[PDB]
Amino acid sequence: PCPWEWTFFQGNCYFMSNSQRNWHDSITACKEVGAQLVVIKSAEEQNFLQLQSSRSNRFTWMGLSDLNQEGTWQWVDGSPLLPSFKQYWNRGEPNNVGEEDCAEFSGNGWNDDKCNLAKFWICKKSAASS
Ligand SMILES: COC(=O)[C@H]1C[C@H](OC[C@H]2O[C@H](OCCN=[N+]=[N-])[C@@H](O)[C@@H](O)[C@@H]2O)[C@@H](O[C@H]2O[C@H](CO)[C@@H](O)[C@H](O)[C@@H]2O)C[C@@H]1C(=O)OC
Ligand SMILES: [Ca+2]
Ligand SMILES: [Ca+2]
Ligand SMILES: [Ca+2]
Ligand SMILES: [Cl-]
Ligand SMILES: [Cl-]
Ligand SMILES: [Cl-]
Structure with a gap:
């Protein structure tokens, strides 16, 4: 199972933040919880x-x-x-x-935007590592 407040999909757990950070700080936040600012690997994961x-x-x-x-x-x-x-x-x-x-x-779909803008973020890590 995924940790409290996370989202499961295809064997990975995702954290959809409820605060906002710029892009670099989002990378750091994900590393703090043993995760990564999400890297998409498949069409179905993108659609999800x-x-x-x-x-x-x-x-x-x-x-x-x-x-x-x-x-x-x-x-x-x-x-x-x-x-x-x-x-x-x-x-x-x-x-x-x-x-x-x-x-x-x-x-x-996706947009390119200013990396110093604060946005929500999504981290990804394996359910088996959670
Ligand atoms: C200079 O950057 C801005 O200040 C401005 C840029 C976008 O609005 C201005 C453009 O509007 C029209 O283009 C529609 C989408 N754009 N492009 N390019 C057109 O009239 C252009 O001549 C103007 O430059 C807007 O950017 C946001 O939305 C677009 C998508 O529409 C996206 O690609 C951007 O990443 C950004 O999210 C707003 C933006 C701004 O600062 O707010 C006014
Ligand atoms: Ca660019
Ligand atoms: Ca853009
Ligand atoms: Ca550039
Ligand atoms: Cl779960
Ligand atoms: Cl990373
Ligand atoms: Cl930028």
Whole structure:
């Protein structure tokens, strides 16, 4: 079972925060609970997490950025953003407006936004590690 206040899906536990943090502080918060700011590995996990964020009406960080090389999106575990996953950007994203280097769930897909903006966040860790 997942810890109190967490969400189970496909053998992992997810913490949907109830406070807001900028993207770096969200990474730290997840590391504090032995988790990671969420790295999506499958289409079904994307569809699941996207829906949680859309129906909660909450702009939410995930563990994805182009801070290192503009236009090259990397997950916080080092894995590249696969071209097929680029289907999950909202229409007209990522658009880098005013420089935007971190990815959030926004509505029915992903947006790039300012990494120093405070948003809700989602951490992920194995249920077996919980
Ligand atoms: C300069 O950044 C802003 O201040 C501003 C940027 C977006 O509003 C301005 C744009 O509106 C129109 O574009 C629609 C989506 N955008 N783009 N680009 C268009 O008239 C443009 O000429 C303007 O630059 C808006 O950004 C938020 O929403 C878009 C999605 O619509 C998203 O991509 C952004 O990441 C951001 O969440 C608002 C933003 C602002 O500062 O509030 C006014
Ligand atoms: Ca940049
Ligand atoms: Ca960018
Ligand atoms: Ca954007
Ligand atoms: Cl559970
Ligand atoms: Cl991490
Ligand atoms: Cl940024």
